[PDB]
Enzyme design. Sequence first.
Site, PDB file in Angstrom:
ATOM      1  N   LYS A 156       0.884  -1.152   0.000  1.00  0.00           N
ATOM      2  CA  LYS A 156       0.000   0.000   0.000  1.00  0.00           C
ATOM      3  C   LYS A 156       0.943   1.228   0.000  1.00  0.00           C
ATOM      4  CE  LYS A 156      -4.632   0.908   2.266  1.00  0.00           C
ATOM      5  NZ  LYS A 156      -5.416  -0.268   1.736  1.00  0.00           N
TER       6      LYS A 156
ATOM      7  N   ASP B  27     -16.958   0.074   6.550  1.00  0.00           N
ATOM      8  CA  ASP B  27     -16.908  -0.033   5.070  1.00  0.00           C
ATOM      9  C   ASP B  27     -16.761  -1.481   4.654  1.00  0.00           C
ATOM     10  OD1 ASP B  27     -16.789   0.817   2.370  1.00  0.00           O
ATOM     11  OD2 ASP B  27     -14.579   1.112   2.515  1.00  0.00           O
TER      12      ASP B  27
END
EC number: 2.7.11.22
Lengths: 297, 258
Positions: A34, A128
Amino acid sequence: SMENFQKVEKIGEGTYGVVYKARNKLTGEVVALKKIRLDTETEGVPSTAIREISLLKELNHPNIVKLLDVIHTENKLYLVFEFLHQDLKKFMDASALTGIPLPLIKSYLFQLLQGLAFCHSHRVLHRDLKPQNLLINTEGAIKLADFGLARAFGVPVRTYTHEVVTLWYRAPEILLGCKYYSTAVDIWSLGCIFAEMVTRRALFPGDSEIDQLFRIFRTLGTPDEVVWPGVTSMPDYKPSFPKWARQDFSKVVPPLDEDGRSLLSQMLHYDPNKRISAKAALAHPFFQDVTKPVPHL
Amino acid sequence: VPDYHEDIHTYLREMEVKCKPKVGYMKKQPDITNSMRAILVDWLVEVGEEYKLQNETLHLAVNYIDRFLSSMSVLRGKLQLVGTAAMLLASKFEEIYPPEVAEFVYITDDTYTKKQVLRMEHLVLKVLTFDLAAPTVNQFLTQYFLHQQPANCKVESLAMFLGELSLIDADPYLKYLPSVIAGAAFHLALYTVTGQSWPESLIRKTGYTLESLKPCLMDLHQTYLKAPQHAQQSIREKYKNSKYHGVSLLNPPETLNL
Ligand SMILES: c1ccc(Nc2nc(OCC3CCCCC3)c3[nH]cnc3n2)cc1
């Protein structure tokens, strides 16, 4: 520095930054990188990267993706992660000719509730859950990913951001503007996700807030003061809502047994205080025979 | 959602010990002092009012400043700079709408550049190794607030104000853990306003009694008494607003009856 990794292919873009599969040249581990582009004289390290990194290093659990490291440059910030084979959405769509066997559904539901209890338990809200954020390995493990929108929360909570959760997986407290939301919202997303692992199609695919609400109400009934005390006083509650009858749950998810229908039905309780918590859901009769089959790959 | 209340209280209690700062760090600060830290925390309250930040935010910001200075030696012209960076970080971690870096730079009457803010932020992120989720007094207070009979909003508010004064002064408050300052502060509030004490149920949850809390309680009690003469007064100013039921205007008890 990034010396030892060998970038191997990109995987995608999640809530912030980009993800690549990589290999440790010296040890052989396959990691998910990431890459967060820094940018001084902007705002600096984004809060999405400050929440995630600090919350993910507190969350170490078999079903929470593991953040292995943080390579902290001055231009770039890299988050090093345990790498996983695919996401649920990508698997679901691949198993759509012969679906997902029940045992694998249950096991994934069971494994997500475990990771989800561990988050709630350490005052973290994911905010989420959706199939794209749920990663599966070739051993049968399923894990919560992308903590970009997550948040540390307080007891009693305060009002947090409202712009929260992907539309289809979003809770009725959020769609109607309740000033206080909590942990009940993560469960609601797992409710939708469970229903989707079964029917292989999203439960409430709205195209807007109002669409979302009305799809929820066509399925579970328009909430009233009886089913949900306080609803009609809520900020975005409207007197004009169509009043729909509740469809009987066996028609909501036809293939499910009685335990499964009972469990999905506790996950989707309108009233956030009655929604079953993740912890309690672990002892539901749905799971008496939960095992861990290794999915086809 | 008291589903996870004993779970979260239990974890918070374990992290206050790991997120806690060195009690003796100011003896090893070659150039800054408690009073110099007292001025900075005051400033930060004020910045807090100015952008309308949560009180939680001022409380994390402080926690970062103390843990940063627990191991980084700092000249006094840089102390604010540590203080602005911790404050952007805390805001970036807790607020719906974090003030922007401009605003951090603006309220230092351009004492520092944007680039400096932003390199300190970064530098606070490595001394602290990105551990920003510290437990605070305010996290412990709000959990203690659930135990009033019935909720007394002067009580909450006066507890908030006192736990908040505990932030300003490194000597004696850095010897005490957050759960303990909130203890003392919740006791001092209830007593003043209602006459009641640290209730039996909080003994059961916390394991803290009037005997555990006295050391902190005596100290917090002299802080309450001297509040009006403290060189630092922005907490007093703030607690005059309606928003916290003007409780900085209530009279501290004469004695405590311990
Ligand atoms: C397919 C192939 C590979 C993966 N692997 C993988 N991906 C991650 O972020 C993947 C993101 C990418 C954008 C959409 C949401 C998920 C990871 N974070 C820790 N481990 C990760 N592993 C996942 C899917």
